[PDB]
Amino acid sequence: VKQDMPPVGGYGPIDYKRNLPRRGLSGYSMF
Amino acid sequence: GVRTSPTGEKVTHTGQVYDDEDYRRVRFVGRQKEVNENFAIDLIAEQPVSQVGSRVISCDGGGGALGHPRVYINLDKETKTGTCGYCGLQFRQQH
C-alpha cells in the first residue's frame, strides 16, 4: 500500500514556544 | 449533426428549437444560441461493432474505474447487436 505517511524516523522537532529574544541595553545603560 | 429550422435557428441534439411565432427567440437577438455541435447520437453510431468470440461480453466503458459500472451483455440474438446500456458501444458474437 502507498499512503500519505510521515517518514521512517518521523518529522523533525517543531518549535512552538514564545521566542522574544530579549535584545537591548540595560535600563542603567540607556540613561 | 446539427441542422437549421426555417427561422434560421439551430436545432439542438434534443430537438429543441423555438417556433417562428414564439417570442422567446428575442433572447438570442444580438446574441447567440449556444448549441453543442458534437451530437452524441451521431458519434456513437460512428463506432464499429466489436466482433467477439464469446456468448456474453462485459463492458465497463474503458479505463477500468474511469468508465461506467461493469455490465454483462448477452449476444444470443443474431438479428440485433448487443448494446451497452451505459456507453452505447455495441457488440456482436462473430459466429
Binding site: 500500500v1 502507498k2 499512503q3 500519505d4 521566542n19 529574544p21 535584545r23 | -
Partner: protein, 55 residues
C-alpha cells in the same frame, strides 16, 4: 532567498530573529505538484469470510 547579505543582515537585525532559517515564502523544499499514484488500503470489513454484516 534572493536578498543580498547586507539587506539580509539589516533585516535579521531589525526583526531580532534569524529570518533566513524560517522563511515565510516557499521554495523547492515543498512537495512536488506531480506525485506518484497512491495505493490506498482497505478497511477491516474487506474480508471474504467471517464477515457477516449482522456481526
Amino acid at each position: 532567498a534572493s536578498a543580498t547579505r547586507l539587506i539580509q543582515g539589516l533585516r535579521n537585525w531589525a526583526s531580532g530573529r534569524d529570518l533566513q532559517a524560517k522563511l515565510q515564502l516557499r521554495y523547492q523544499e515543498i512537495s512536488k505538484r506531480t506525485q506518484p499514484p497512491p495505493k490506498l488500503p482497505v478497511g477491516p470489513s474487506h474480508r471474504l469470510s467471517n464477515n457477516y454484516y449482522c456481526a
